[PDB]
Design an enzyme around this catalytic site. Structure first.
Site, PDB file in Angstrom:
ATOM      1  CG  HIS A   7      22.976   2.157  -2.145  1.00 21.27           C
ATOM      2  ND1 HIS A   7      24.375   2.073  -1.906  1.00 21.27           N
ATOM      3  CD2 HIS A   7      22.460   0.907  -2.026  1.00 21.27           C
ATOM      4  CE1 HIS A   7      24.601   0.768  -1.678  1.00 21.27           C
ATOM      5  NE2 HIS A   7      23.485   0.022  -1.707  1.00 21.27           N
ATOM      6  CD  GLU A  43      24.459  -3.116  -8.286  1.00 17.99           C
ATOM      7  OE1 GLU A  43      25.372  -3.727  -7.690  1.00 17.99           O
ATOM      8  OE2 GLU A  43      24.177  -1.889  -8.120  1.00 17.99           O
ATOM      9  CD  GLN A  60      22.586  -1.592  -4.681  1.00 19.05           C
ATOM     10  OE1 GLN A  60      22.223  -1.934  -3.578  1.00 19.05           O
ATOM     11  NE2 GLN A  60      23.856  -1.531  -5.078  1.00 19.05           N
ATOM     12  CG  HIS A  84      20.084  -3.004   1.066  1.00 17.98           C
ATOM     13  ND1 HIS A  84      19.823  -3.817  -0.037  1.00 17.98           N
ATOM     14  CD2 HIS A  84      21.175  -2.249   0.738  1.00 17.98           C
ATOM     15  CE1 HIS A  84      20.710  -3.483  -1.003  1.00 17.98           C
ATOM     16  NE2 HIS A  84      21.573  -2.541  -0.568  1.00 17.98           N
ATOM     17  CD  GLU A 134      25.562  -1.986   0.620  1.00 14.91           C
ATOM     18  OE1 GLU A 134      24.444  -2.222   0.215  1.00 14.91           O
ATOM     19  OE2 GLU A 134      26.509  -1.389  -0.074  1.00 14.91           O
TER      20      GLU A 134
HETATM   21  C1  LIG Z   1      26.081  -5.677  -4.357  1.00 12.53           C
HETATM   22  C2  LIG Z   1      25.388  -4.732  -3.377  1.00 12.53           C
HETATM   23  C3  LIG Z   1      24.176  -5.145  -2.731  1.00 12.53           C
HETATM   24  O1  LIG Z   1      23.518  -4.325  -2.084  1.00 12.53           O
HETATM   25  S1  LIG Z   1      23.784  -6.804  -2.820  1.00 12.53           S
HETATM   26  C4  LIG Z   1      22.248  -6.932  -1.843  1.00 12.53           C
HETATM   27  C5  LIG Z   1      21.867  -8.437  -1.655  1.00 12.53           C
HETATM   28  N1  LIG Z   1      22.711  -8.998  -0.637  1.00 12.53           N
HETATM   29  C6  LIG Z   1      22.447  -8.977   0.647  1.00 12.53           C
HETATM   30  O2  LIG Z   1      21.358  -8.583   1.111  1.00 12.53           O
HETATM   31  C7  LIG Z   1      23.448  -9.628   1.571  1.00 12.53           C
HETATM   32  C8  LIG Z   1      23.136  -9.501   3.059  1.00 12.53           C
HETATM   33  N2  LIG Z   1      21.927 -10.171   3.518  1.00 12.53           N
HETATM   34  C9  LIG Z   1      21.916 -11.437   4.015  1.00 12.53           C
HETATM   35  O3  LIG Z   1      22.989 -11.992   4.128  1.00 12.53           O
HETATM   36  C10 LIG Z   1      20.741 -12.173   4.440  1.00 12.53           C
HETATM   37  O4  LIG Z   1      19.745 -11.799   3.552  1.00 12.53           O
HETATM   38  C11 LIG Z   1      20.241 -11.938   5.800  1.00 12.53           C
HETATM   39  C12 LIG Z   1      20.677 -10.782   6.627  1.00 12.53           C
HETATM   40  C13 LIG Z   1      21.283 -12.854   6.464  1.00 12.53           C
HETATM   41  C14 LIG Z   1      18.994 -12.686   6.211  1.00 12.53           C
HETATM   42  O5  LIG Z   1      19.153 -13.949   5.589  1.00 12.53           O
HETATM   43  P1  LIG Z   1      18.519 -15.271   6.268  1.00 12.53           P
HETATM   44  O6  LIG Z   1      19.428 -16.401   5.826  1.00 12.53           O
HETATM   45  O7  LIG Z   1      18.469 -15.241   7.758  1.00 12.53           O
HETATM   46  O8  LIG Z   1      17.066 -15.228   5.620  1.00 12.53           O
HETATM   47  P2  LIG Z   1      15.778 -15.345   6.552  1.00 12.53           P
HETATM   48  O9  LIG Z   1      14.647 -15.215   5.536  1.00 12.53           O
HETATM   49  O10 LIG Z   1      15.819 -16.628   7.334  1.00 12.53           O
HETATM   50  O11 LIG Z   1      15.419 -14.208   7.624  1.00 12.53           O
HETATM   51  C15 LIG Z   1      15.949 -14.064   8.934  1.00 12.53           C
HETATM   52  C16 LIG Z   1      15.194 -12.972   9.583  1.00 12.53           C
HETATM   53  O12 LIG Z   1      15.685 -11.742   8.934  1.00 12.53           O
HETATM   54  C17 LIG Z   1      14.615 -11.009   8.407  1.00 12.53           C
HETATM   55  N3  LIG Z   1      15.104 -10.372   7.132  1.00 12.53           N
HETATM   56  C18 LIG Z   1      15.621 -10.974   6.085  1.00 12.53           C
HETATM   57  N4  LIG Z   1      15.957 -10.119   5.051  1.00 12.53           N
HETATM   58  C19 LIG Z   1      15.610  -8.898   5.583  1.00 12.53           C
HETATM   59  C20 LIG Z   1      15.666  -7.567   4.982  1.00 12.53           C
HETATM   60  N5  LIG Z   1      16.196  -7.329   3.759  1.00 12.53           N
HETATM   61  N6  LIG Z   1      15.243  -6.574   5.806  1.00 12.53           N
HETATM   62  C21 LIG Z   1      14.706  -6.818   7.023  1.00 12.53           C
HETATM   63  N7  LIG Z   1      14.655  -7.979   7.610  1.00 12.53           N
HETATM   64  C22 LIG Z   1      15.045  -9.029   6.892  1.00 12.53           C
HETATM   65  C23 LIG Z   1      13.594 -12.123   8.104  1.00 12.53           C
HETATM   66  O13 LIG Z   1      12.291 -11.622   7.916  1.00 12.53           O
HETATM   67  C24 LIG Z   1      13.709 -13.034   9.318  1.00 12.53           C
HETATM   68  O14 LIG Z   1      13.010 -12.346  10.323  1.00 12.53           O
HETATM   69  P3  LIG Z   1      11.791 -13.186  11.059  1.00 12.53           P
HETATM   70  O15 LIG Z   1      12.498 -14.475  11.497  1.00 12.53           O
HETATM   71  O16 LIG Z   1      11.292 -12.155  12.061  1.00 12.53           O
HETATM   72  O17 LIG Z   1      10.787 -13.557   9.990  1.00 12.53           O
HETATM   73  N8  LIG Z   1      25.864  -3.414  -3.296  1.00 12.53           N
HETATM   74  O18 LIG Z   1      27.021  -3.239  -3.879  1.00 12.53           O
HETATM   75  O19 LIG Z   1      25.341  -2.419  -2.673  1.00 12.53           O
HETATM   76 CO   LIG Z   2      23.427  -2.162  -1.650  1.00 12.92          CO
END
Ligand SMILES: CC(C(=O)SCCNC(=O)CCNC(=O)[C@H](O)C(C)(C)COP(=O)(O)OP(=O)(O)OC[C@H]1O[C@@H](n2cnc3c(N)ncnc32)[C@H](O)[C@@H]1OP(=O)(O)O)=[N+]([O-])[O-]
Ligand SMILES: [Co+2]
Ligand SMILES: CC(C(=O)SCCNC(=O)CCNC(=O)[C@H](O)C(C)(C)COP(=O)(O)OP(=O)(O)OC[C@H]1O[C@@H](n2cnc3c(N)ncnc32)[C@H](O)[C@@H]1OP(=O)(O)O)=[N+]([O-])[O-]
Ligand SMILES: [Cl-]
Ligand SMILES: [Cl-]
Ligand SMILES: [Co+2]
Lengths: 144, 144
Positions: A7, A43, A60, A84, A134
């Site tokens: 996705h 979502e 998604q 993502h 992912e």
């Molecule tokens: C349920 C499901 C889903 O898809 S749920 C989707 C929502 N959940 C997720 O995204 C979970 C995984 N993501 C995360 O844990 C966090 O968002 C991240 C990877 C840890 C980043 O979180 P942080 O706590 O560090 O946030 P933070 O804003 O501090 O950002 C840390 C650094 O990561 C970069 N960053 C954050 N989100 C980003 C993204 N989506 N893409 C690219 N870069 C990103 C951000 O710009 C910064 O870079 P920079 O320092 O050069 O400016 N599904 O089934 O498929």
């Molecule tokens: Co996803």
């Protein structure tokens, strides 16, 4: 092995409005909708095609359930757009371990629950040339 | 009709380094590489899967050939990451006309040359909830 694009994760402020955009513009319909309170998203999955590994490829669409969430923080900083990309695998636990052993940050020790009972993990975008990545194994096992 | 996700367009500063990242991390190999001087990109296509419409789904990695280009400007503002998404169709001219008639901005009057002799057009991201959206018809006609 990663055998498909599963996705594209697209962040939006208003899930219902964005779902209608994709239906009206392209004819894409809703395959499934769910709330994931752990991840902080509401979502909708829009199925675009089936894939040669026996799986499928979706859009998604994600709206945040709270500001203090991955998607809420991202939308506040960047506005609506691609959040993502997800690759499908028959064994996310094995692929995640192999990638951990290359020194790419795997965000979860063990895969977590995602859409439609899937099991998911993520790779840190700063270790993936700026792409939040992912890895997912579908709950319903696929027949190539 | 839009019948597949054709590719994810991923911008990078160094195509060779990013290509090696995807090979070393996931085992994805290069399907094709080309320079598009009109668009101002050097690109690599990495095939991830075949699709149920007879086509395929790729990662399209793009480095700019010049700063004064869509990808050069975007990388300067945003850093490396997802730049666009592309949907495949058997008739990009017809789908582009139908979308123009909905008031979404179609950037080209007529489709232009893309990868592997494909014909492409784009929809303005501000009319697509922040997602630069490509429509593509492959040069080699597909058998579902
Ligand atoms: C349920 C499901 C889903 O898809 S749920 C989707 C929502 N959940 C997720 O995204 C979970 C995984 N993501 C995360 O844990 C966090 O968002 C991240 C990877 C840890 C980043 O979180 P942080 O706590 O560090 O946030 P933070 O804003 O501090 O950002 C840390 C650094 O990561 C970069 N960053 C954050 N989100 C980003 C993204 N989506 N893409 C690219 N870069 C990103 C951000 O710009 C910064 O870079 P920079 O320092 O050069 O400016 N599904 O089934 O498929
Ligand atoms: Co996803
Ligand atoms: C060969 C091929 C390819 O894929 S070649 C890929 C490279 N070529 C292309 O992207 C061509 C189509 N794109 C374009 O023509 C232009 O980049 C766009 C759509 C017109 C935007 O160009 P502009 O001249 O307006 O640049 P500009 O930075 O002024 O940006 C205008 C507005 O669009 C937003 N924007 C620009 N690029 C964007 C992108 N890739 N995604 C999301 N939003 C974007 C930008 O942030 C700004 O919003 P903001 O005002 O809220 O900040 N292939 O075969 O598949
Ligand atoms: Cl839940
Ligand atoms: Cl050329
Ligand atoms: Co493209």
């Amino acid at each position: 092995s990663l055998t498909r694009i599963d996705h594209i994760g697209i962040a939006c402020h208003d899930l219902d409005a964005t779902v209608e955009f994709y239906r009206a513009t392209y004819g894409f319909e809703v395959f499934h909708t769910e709330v994931n309170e752990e991840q902080g998203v509401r979502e909708a999955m829009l199925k675009i095609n089936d894939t040669s590994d026996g799986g499928a490829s979706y859009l998604q669409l994600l709206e945040p359930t709270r500001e203090d969430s991955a998607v809420g923080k991202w939308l506040a900083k960047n506005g609506e757009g691609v959040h993502h990309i997800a690759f499908g695998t028959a064994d996310v636990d094995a692929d995640a371990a192999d990638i951990r052993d290359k020194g790419v940050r795997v965000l979860y020790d063990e895969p977590r629950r995602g859409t439609m009972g899937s099991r998911i993990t993520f790779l840190h975008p700063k270790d993936c040339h700026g792409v939040l990545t992912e890895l997912v194994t579908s709950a319903a096992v696929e027949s190539p």
